[PDB]
Design a protein around this ligand. Sequence first.
Ligand SMILES: Nc1ncnc2c1ncn2[C@@H]1O[C@H](COP(=O)(O)OP(=O)(O)O)[C@@H](O)[C@H]1O
Length: 292
Amino acid sequence: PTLKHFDENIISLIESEIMSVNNEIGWADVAGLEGAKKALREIVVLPFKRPDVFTGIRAPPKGVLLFGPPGTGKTMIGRCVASQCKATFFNISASSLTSKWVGEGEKLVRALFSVARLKLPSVIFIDEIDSLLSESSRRIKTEFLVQLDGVNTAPDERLLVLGATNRPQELDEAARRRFQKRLYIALPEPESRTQIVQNLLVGTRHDITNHNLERIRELTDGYSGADMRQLCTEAAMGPIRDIGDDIETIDKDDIRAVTVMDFAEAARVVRPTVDDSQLDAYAAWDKKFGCL
Ligand SMILES: Nc1ncnc2c1ncn2[C@@H]1O[C@H](COP(=O)(O)OP(=O)(O)O)[C@@H](O)[C@H]1O
């Protein structure tokens, strides 16, 4: 707290639950997405590392839009991107703005860009940004565009706004225009899905074999990484449900290992959250608006 003065509660709200700083966390736990990984590195990381090189025609975009089905790790992708540029991270939802924090919001959208503005390099992550760019809602939704044109008005500032959306087909020309680059973050590849599962099972007693991984991969077509997590929780319930009344007395170590059937059954309960008709409406939007 210094050099600036809004309600001193706004500032705290930022230090407390927007402002974040994570060092040297690479891509860790973000599975797959090689395409997008490459691009973010080219368009944001490299530029933040060498602003002496990336000027003139080699300037980075000030606005990148990540879009795709929900539960594809978009918010963490942002956290890693920030971590590799050794940048101050600012995570914030547009719903937290247009509901949890209204009236106060417009004053906060301002203070956000001010803080960011002096923690350079800074990365501002706005989740569900399509709501923000579509009432006190309008008062805020305006201050926002104000704030974000300013970003396109300071030349040598290492300040990127990173916006994420599950509903890109919901952004008009003037909206999409604020985004030089537009990255499609899509559902886990088959091999990605099983890496997730392996992360999620660490610390849980299980007999999952590589041959099993393959069966799981086989019946988790269309699953997001969030579904995969749902899957694992449900699968882990198998042992739990085999008990009954010993439950309150049983040794946790005596709990049956998680097995492939656990997943096979789990899969029957936990189904993909994305309708095939949507994956197309994404691919269509992407090939006509995305940096493919
Ligand atoms: N590489 C990945 N791609 C997609 N989802 C992942 C990945 N790694 C982990 N997840 C799962 O996704 C969930 C959170 O997704 P999130 O980062 O909120 O995605 P989005 O911002 O696209 O909604 C976590 O519970 C996690 O288990």
